[PDB]
Write a protein that binds this ligand. Structure first.
Ligand code: NA
Ligand code: NA
Ligand code: NA
Ligand code: NA
Ligand code: NA
Length: 234
């Protein structure tokens, strides 16, 4: 922390997509950088739907919802079902219950990115003013994985359970995508999360790249999996 890793092959993965990207990896207390645009690692970007992790923690901690509540499609969904889908009404609904005031206090207490939420409680993560670096994101998700955020242990466990993405060969991959696509240029794509390896060890990641509208949403996962293989993390 914080050093370029062995980055030969991974830089070429990003080059092949004709876009700039970084992958930050945090093991215990040590952070390595990979990709073709390493300066992105300490550049601030809007978090986009990666903020849903923190919205859920704040909402659950403050009893503004619970994991069994059904949000009406006015499909009907729980908070957890909505985590992995596009569900801005649901997370937007939650943000309104929290309210601008409690949201700003919580974001300040956690110290997430620039910790600015402005005056519009239901879109500050999508269009600004809140911004965060990929290094900060990996640090945040590492803390969540290890139950070290200053929230209830049970709330952290319940949000972690919402983030399982894919699993294979005894490895579990947890995380959250984001894509700030509308109202923001250049577009920014996130995939932030962690690997739990078969013996229990945790390796956290934050992928951050420039997106274009013609890209498939799976490009983030594709680049992540290739890179984690190269690094022997999976
Ligand atoms: Na941005
Ligand atoms: Na309900
Ligand atoms: Na949202
Ligand atoms: Na994929
Ligand atoms: Na491998």
């Amino acid at each position: 922390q914080i050093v370029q890793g062995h980055n030969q092959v991974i830089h070429q993965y990003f080059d092949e997509k004709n876009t700039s990207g970084v992958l930050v990896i945090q093991t215990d207390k040590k952070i390595n950088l990979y990709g073709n645009a390493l300066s992105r690692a300490n550049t601030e970007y809007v978090p986009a739907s990666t903020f849903k992790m923190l919205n859920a923690l704040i909402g659950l901690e403050n009893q503004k919802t619970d994991i069994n509540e059904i949000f009406k499609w006015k499909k009907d969904m729980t908070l957890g079902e909505a985590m992995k889908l596009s569900a801005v009404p649901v997370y937007q609904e939650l943000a309104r219950r929290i309210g601008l005031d409690l949201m700003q206090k919580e974001v300040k207490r956690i110290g997430f990115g620039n910790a600015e939420i402005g005056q519009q409680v239901d879109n500050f993560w999508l269009v600004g003013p809140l911004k965060v670096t990929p290094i900060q994101e990996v640090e945040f998700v590492s803390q969540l994985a290890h139950t070290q955020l200053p929230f209830s242990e049970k709330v952290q466990a319940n949000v972690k359970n919402m983030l399982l993405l894919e699993e294979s060969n005894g490895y579990k991959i947890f995380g959250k995508t984001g894509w700030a696509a509308m109202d923001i240029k250049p577009q920014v794509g996130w995939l932030t999360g962690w690997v739990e390896q078969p013996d229990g060890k945790i390796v956290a990641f934050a992928l951050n790249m420039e997106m274009r509208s013609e890209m498939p949403a799976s490009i983030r996962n594709e680049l992540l999996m290739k890179s984690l293989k190269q690094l022997n993390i999976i």
